């Protein structure tokens, strides 16, 4: 599927990215844990989405997982149709 990328012509001029990614550890303090793979050239070299489903199936299902929590104390009828806010307005107001 890397043969069908949106930008292929510009990626055709990108050589030596493995040696360069090896030597990036002398330019940055943040160690890249995926130094070996480049997702534009190598592609999507794994896929761990199915794990999520199985771990729910491991923990007793959504009903059991949510009944460990205060889900039923919130007045929400069903778990579908919900979302989590990453930060409240107070947190983003005080960040800077």
């Amino acid at each position: 599927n890397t043969l069908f990328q949106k930008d292929r012509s510009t990626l055709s001029f990108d050589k030596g990215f493995r040696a360069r990614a090896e030597f990036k550890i002398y330019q940055l303090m943040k160690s890249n844990p995926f130094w070996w793979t480049n997702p534009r050239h190598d592609g999507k070299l794994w896929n761990l989405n199915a794990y999520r489903t199985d771990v729910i199936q491991a923990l007793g299902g959504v009903e059991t997982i949510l009944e460990h929590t205060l889900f039923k104390a919130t007045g929400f009828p069903s778990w579908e149709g919900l979302f989590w806010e990453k930060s409240s307005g107070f947190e983003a107001s005080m960040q800077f």
Binding site: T2, L3, R8, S9, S12
Partner: peptide, 25 residues
């Protein structure tokens, strides 16, 4: 266009020669 097609073909040949490396030649 033809220029973008030529560079994309160069990319595709590069990916092929990266995948075929070690077995035909």
């Amino acid at each position: 266009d033809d220029s973008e097609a030529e560079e994309r073909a160069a990319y595709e040949e590069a990916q092929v020669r990266a995948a075929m490396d070690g077995l035909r030649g």
